[PDB]
Amino acid sequence: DWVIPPINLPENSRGPFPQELVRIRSDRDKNLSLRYSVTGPGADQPPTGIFIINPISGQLSVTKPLDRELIARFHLRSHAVDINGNQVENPMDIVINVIDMNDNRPEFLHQVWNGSVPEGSKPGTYVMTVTAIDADDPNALNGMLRYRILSQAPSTPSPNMFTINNETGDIITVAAGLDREKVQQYTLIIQATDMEGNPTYGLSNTATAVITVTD
Amino acid sequence: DWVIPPINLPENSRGPFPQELVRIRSDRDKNLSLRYSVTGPGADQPPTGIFIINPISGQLSVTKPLDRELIARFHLRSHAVDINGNQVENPMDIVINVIDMNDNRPEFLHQVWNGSVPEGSKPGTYVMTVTAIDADDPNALNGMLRYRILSQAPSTPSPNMFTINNETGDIITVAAGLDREKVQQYTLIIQATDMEGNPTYGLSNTATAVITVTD
Ligand SMILES: [Ca+2]
Ligand SMILES: [Ca+2]
Ligand SMILES: [Ca+2]
Ligand SMILES: [Ca+2]
Ligand SMILES: [Ca+2]
Ligand SMILES: [Ca+2]
């Protein structure tokens, strides 16, 4: 069979609805009067009525806005029948990929994280790991996160005693001079931002990490 | 066989080129490496190079702006061949319609039209008929004319002694007091305007109508 290629379709479709996707037809038109129809999950199986087809023209249409997070792919099959109901073509697979859109922001597993670190710890010492998640596709830019520290109270002896690992969320000491008798609890605001942490196009969320220095 | 439907295309395309039309493929690409091509007047036969297809991806494209008044329809055929060169599908017929654009203004059959009317004639008299053509599609708005008079000479006894049949181009008298000893010859300027005469968008052209009154 000469098949039609996969239909890639951005989620949160703008409208107006029902928007057309593709017109299909069987070259048997010229002989006899036909009737088109589509079957499978999306059409005549739950969730029904999302994809519809014109019995006459073969114009396949989508009715509602899609959501990759709910259904990321639809496998449909189109058919062709004559006036007294007989199959005139081998049902064609129509694959519909719901393309991902950056429609939900990062989310830390907790609002406050807690960590510890012994005083006078050599630069390079590991303290704790914050992690966040994103309901977008991890393979798409929409789902790829990057962490950064925004603030650091108090700001002594250095205004950045710590560094966050860009990708992994692991926090490390860069500075020396951790002295409990001077600063007991550093408090960081970490920001996880998506799309490789693109400032303009990236969504963000923040959390807090409280690093107690111990004796 | 399931086939792709006709492709519609406005003439006088803007670009940039090559602008793509439709991606086709054969479901044999899963088994073996394929190679697509196109044939016919428009592809490999004269005029050559207007339409092309990507050997690997099957993306069909247009290279140049089209012109309905030169070629209004293209009959192509797509092929799919295996590595060694054998056909792997029945060539698919591809129909391409060049949709009309209003790209040329109306044209009168004569610059100067002559006509007659007996003196003192009744209001309602046919005197002559003027007709203009249009190289655009008669059935589209781009080729549907509306005639009308722009000015008269002289403007006595009335400033508008005549009127034009809005659609047909039959000129009809709307005033009496025609007299060879007062005004021997009138001379009108008629204006054919396309697109149901739409003053804003429609293109126009003018011609003359010389109406002699007789004893
Ligand atoms: Ca969504
Ligand atoms: Ca996101
Ligand atoms: Ca998404
Ligand atoms: Ca043209
Ligand atoms: Ca035209
Ligand atoms: Ca025209």
CATH of the domain at A204: 2.60.40.60
Terminal alpha carbon distance of chain B: 75
A135 CA to middle of ligand 5, Å?
Answer: 51
DSSP state for residue B154 in the 8-state scheme: S
Task: From A78, A101, A124, give the residue that closes a domain.
Answer: A101
CA distance B63 to B56: 18
B141 CB neighbour count, 10 Å cutoff: 15
What ligand is nearest to the CA atom of residue B13?
4
Residue B96 and residue B113 in one domain: no
Closest CA to B161 of B145, B137, B183: B183
Q: Residue B49 sits in which domain range?
A: 1-101
Largest CA distance in chain A: 93
Contacts of B163 (CB under 8 A, 6+ apart): B149, B171, B172, B173, B174
**C-alpha dihedral (A156, A162, A166, A171), degrees to nearest 10:** -140
Chain B residues touching residue A89 (CB < 8 angstroms): 1-2
Q: Resolution in angstroms, to 1 decimal, for this deposition?
A: 3.3
Domain stops at, among A101, A125, A153: A101
The reply to whether B21 and B92 lie within a common domain is yes
Beta-bridge partners for A108: A132
Which residues does B contribute to its contact with A (CB < 8 Å)? 1-5, 23-27, 58, 80, 89-90, 92-93
| A96 and A173 both lie in a single domain | no
CB B50 within 8 A of CB B62: yes
Residues A96 and A109 in one domain: no
Q: How many CA atoms lie within 13 A of A186 on its CB side?
A: 33
Find chain B residues with C-beta within 8 A of A30's C-beta.
none
Cβ density class B103-122: b for 16+ within 10 Å, e for less? eebbebeeeebebebeeebe
Q: How many domains does chain B have?
A: 2
- The technique is X-ray
Task: Give the minimum alpha-carbon distance from B38 to chain A in angstroms, rounded to a whole number.
Answer: 14
Contact A26, A115 (CB under 8 A): no
Give CA–CA dist A195/A201, Å, rounded.
7
Is A202 in the same domain as A160? yes
Helix (H) and strand (E) counts for chain B? Answer: 0, 19
Whether residue A41 has a cis bond before it, omega within 30° of 0: no
Say if residue B82 is in the same domain as residue B126.
Answer: no
Tell whether A115 and A87 lie within a shared domain: no
* A86, A136, B76, B88, B214 from B3: Cα distances, Å: 19, 36, 13, 15, 68
Asked if A91 contacts A79 with a C-beta cutoff of 8 angstroms, the reply is yes
> Could you tell me which of B144, B12, B109 has the C-alpha nearest to residue B65?
B12
Contacts of A84 (CB under 8 A, 6+ apart): none
Chain A positions touching B89 (Cβ under 8 A) are 2
Query: What is the distance between the alpha carbons of residues B171 and B124, in angstroms, rounded to a whole number?
Result: 9
- Give the pairing of strands A73-81 and A35-39: antiparallel
**Which ligand sits nearest to residue A66's alpha carbon?**
1
Tell me, yes or no, whether B81 and B114 share the same domain: no
Binding residues of B: 11, 67, 69, 100-104, 134, 136, 142, 194
Chosen domain end from B44, B70, B101: B101
Other Cβ atoms closer than 10 A to B41:
16
Same domain, B111 and B160: yes
The count of C-alpha atoms lying within 13 angstroms of the C-alpha of A210, restricted to the half-sphere facing its C-beta, is 8
What's the rounded Cα separation, in Å, for the pair B51 and B41? 9
On whether both A155 and A212 belong to a single domain, the answer is yes
- Reading the block at residue A172, the tokens are 């490390």
Examine the domain organization and report whether A138 and A185 are in the same domain: yes
At residue A28, the 3 state secondary structure works out as helix
